[PDB]
Design a protein around this motif. Sequence first.
Motif, short mmCIF file in Angstrom:
data_model
loop_
_atom_site.label_atom_id
_atom_site.label_comp_id
_atom_site.label_asym_id
_atom_site.label_seq_id
_atom_site.Cartn_x
_atom_site.Cartn_y
_atom_site.Cartn_z
N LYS A 1 8.89 1.42 -64.35
CA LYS A 1 10.00 1.04 -65.22
C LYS A 1 11.33 1.45 -64.61
CE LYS A 1 10.43 5.38 -67.53
NZ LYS A 1 11.22 5.89 -68.68
N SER A 2 12.40 0.88 -65.15
CA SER A 2 13.75 1.28 -64.78
C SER A 2 14.14 2.55 -65.53
CB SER A 2 14.75 0.16 -65.07
OG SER A 2 15.97 0.45 -64.40
N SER A 3 14.68 3.52 -64.82
CA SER A 3 15.11 4.81 -65.33
C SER A 3 16.60 5.06 -65.06
CB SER A 3 14.34 5.98 -64.71
OG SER A 3 15.07 7.18 -64.95
N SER A 4 17.35 5.10 -66.14
CA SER A 4 18.78 5.38 -66.16
C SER A 4 19.06 6.80 -65.67
CB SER A 4 19.35 5.19 -67.57
OG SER A 4 18.98 3.94 -68.13
N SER A 5 18.30 7.74 -66.22
CA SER A 5 18.40 9.15 -65.88
C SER A 5 18.27 9.34 -64.38
CB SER A 5 17.30 9.94 -66.59
OG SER A 5 16.03 9.47 -66.18
N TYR B 1 14.29 2.20 -60.29
CA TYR B 1 12.90 2.04 -60.67
C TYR B 1 12.05 3.22 -60.19
CZ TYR B 1 13.52 -2.82 -62.12
OH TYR B 1 13.93 -3.97 -62.76
N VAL B 2 11.20 3.69 -61.09
CA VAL B 2 10.23 4.74 -60.85
C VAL B 2 8.84 4.30 -61.31
CG1 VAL B 2 11.86 6.65 -61.14
CG2 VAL B 2 10.53 5.83 -63.10
N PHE B 3 7.83 4.94 -60.74
CA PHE B 3 6.44 4.58 -61.01
C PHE B 3 5.52 5.77 -60.81
CE2 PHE B 3 5.01 4.63 -56.67
CZ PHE B 3 6.22 4.68 -56.01
N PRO B 4 4.31 5.75 -61.37
CA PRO B 4 3.36 6.86 -61.15
C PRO B 4 2.97 6.95 -59.67
CG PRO B 4 2.66 5.49 -62.97
CD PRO B 4 3.72 4.71 -62.22
N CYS B 5 3.12 8.15 -59.12
CA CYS B 5 2.82 8.43 -57.72
C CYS B 5 1.39 8.04 -57.37
CB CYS B 5 3.08 9.91 -57.39
SG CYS B 5 4.81 10.46 -57.51
N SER B 6 0.49 7.96 -58.35
CA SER B 6 -0.89 7.56 -58.11
C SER B 6 -1.06 6.06 -57.89
CB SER B 6 -1.79 7.99 -59.28
OG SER B 6 -1.39 7.40 -60.51
N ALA B 7 -0.12 5.22 -58.31
CA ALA B 7 -0.30 3.78 -58.13
C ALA B 7 -0.38 3.36 -56.67
CB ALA B 7 0.85 3.04 -58.81
N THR B 8 -1.07 2.25 -56.42
CA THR B 8 -1.06 1.64 -55.08
C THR B 8 -0.10 0.45 -55.14
OG1 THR B 8 -3.29 2.39 -54.41
CG2 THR B 8 -2.41 0.52 -53.26
N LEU B 9 0.95 0.48 -54.34
CA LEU B 9 2.03 -0.51 -54.45
C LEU B 9 1.69 -1.78 -53.69
CD1 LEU B 9 5.28 1.66 -54.04
CD2 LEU B 9 4.18 0.94 -56.17
N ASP C 1 6.82 3.28 -51.50
CA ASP C 1 6.69 4.55 -52.22
C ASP C 1 7.65 5.51 -51.54
OD1 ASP C 1 3.77 6.75 -52.86
OD2 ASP C 1 5.91 7.20 -52.93
N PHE C 2 8.82 5.72 -52.16
CA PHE C 2 9.76 6.55 -51.42
C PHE C 2 9.46 8.04 -51.54
CE2 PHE C 2 13.65 8.51 -49.97
CZ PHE C 2 13.65 7.90 -48.73
N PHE D 1 9.98 7.71 -56.76
CA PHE D 1 11.10 6.77 -56.74
C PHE D 1 10.78 5.54 -55.91
CE2 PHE D 1 15.63 5.53 -55.77
CZ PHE D 1 16.05 5.34 -57.07
N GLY D 2 11.13 4.33 -56.38
CA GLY D 2 10.79 3.14 -55.61
C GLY D 2 11.73 2.88 -54.44
N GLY D 3 11.22 2.28 -53.36
CA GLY D 3 12.07 2.05 -52.20
C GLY D 3 12.81 0.72 -52.23
N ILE D 4 12.54 -0.09 -53.24
CA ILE D 4 13.21 -1.37 -53.47
C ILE D 4 14.00 -1.27 -54.77
CG2 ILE D 4 12.96 -3.83 -53.94
CD1 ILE D 4 10.41 -3.91 -52.40
#
Lengths: 329, 8
Positions: free
Chosen positions: A242-246, A250-258, A278-279, A290-293
Motif C-alpha cells: 500500500k501507499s504510506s504517507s508516513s 509504497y511499502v509491502f511485507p518484507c516476506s512477499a516475493t515481488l 525490494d529496497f 520500502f519499494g524501489g519503484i
Amino acid sequence: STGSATTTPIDSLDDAYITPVQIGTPAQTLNLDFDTGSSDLWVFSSETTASEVXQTIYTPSKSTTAKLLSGATWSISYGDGSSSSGDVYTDTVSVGGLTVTGQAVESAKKVSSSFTEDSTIDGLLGLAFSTLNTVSPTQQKTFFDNAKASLDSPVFTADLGYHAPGTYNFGFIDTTAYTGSITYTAVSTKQGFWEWTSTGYAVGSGTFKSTSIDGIADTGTTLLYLPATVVSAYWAQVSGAKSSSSVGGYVFPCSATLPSFTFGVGSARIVIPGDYIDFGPISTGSSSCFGGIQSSAGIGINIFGDVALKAAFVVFNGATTPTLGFASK
Amino acid sequence: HSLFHXTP
C-alpha cells in the motif's frame, strides 16, 4: 586512451555508488559519486567550513598542478534540495588510468547538512551535458567532455552491481560484460540530461503495454520513478502493498516475493528482477519494506535511477549526436 | 545515508 574503475555501493541498500578519483600532483584519491544527472565536479576541500566537514578533502595547496580559476564561482542544488557552493581550480584528474589535464575542480566552501552527514562521499563527478554546469561566468566542461579528444571511442559505460561492486569504463565497450546485443535509442539534450523515451512496460508475466515514457538516465538517483498509473499497476500485483504517507511511498511485507518489471528500449526489453525492487525494511527489524519503484508525480520528471540501471549494461554514447544503449546482463 | 536524487 581508456580508463576502467571499480564502483562500490556505499551501503547494504545500494543507496549510491562511489568511484575512486585521483586529483592533483601528487595524486589525492577521493571517493566521488558519479552522477549522470548533473555536470559539476565538486569535492570537499581545505576551503570547506570546518564545522561542515565530518570525508577526505582536497587540498589545492598541496597539488603542484592546481591553478586558481580567477573570478569563477559555482552554486548548485539537487533534486532532494541539498546544495553546495565555492570557487574553482583547474587540476589534473585521473579515473582508472585515464588522465585529463586542466579539469575544472570545483572546491566547496560550504555544503548542506546531508552532505556533511554522509561520510562515504567525498564529492560528485557530473556526467550530464556541460550546459548544466553551474560555474559562472563561463561554464566548465565535464570530465567526459575533456577526455573525448583522447578516448579510443567517445563513450563510457555503467555496469552497476546489485549489492556488489561494478565498473565504470571510459572509451571502450566490454563485450564480455553483457549478454545479447546492445540496443541504442536516441537522446534529447534539450534540458541537458541523458533524456530518452521508453517504449513501454510490463509487470511480471503480464502483457507489455506500448506507451511512451520520457525519462532521464540518472546514476545519481537511487530509485526508479515512473508515472503514477504505471506505478499503481505494479503494486496492484503485490497483495500486502500500500501507499504510506508516513513513509512517503509504497511499502509491502518484507516476506512477499515481488514481480519483475520490464521496460522497453526500442524493440528490446529490459527486465528488472523482483528482488532489485525490494529496497529494504523501513527500519532494521521491521516487517515492512520500502519499494524501489515510486511515483514521479511530485518530481516533474521520470527518473531511471540505480534500481533500473543496475539491471542492465548501459552505454553512454557521447558522439556529436549522442545515444543511449542498453543490454541485458 | 539517505535516498539520493542527484540537478533541476
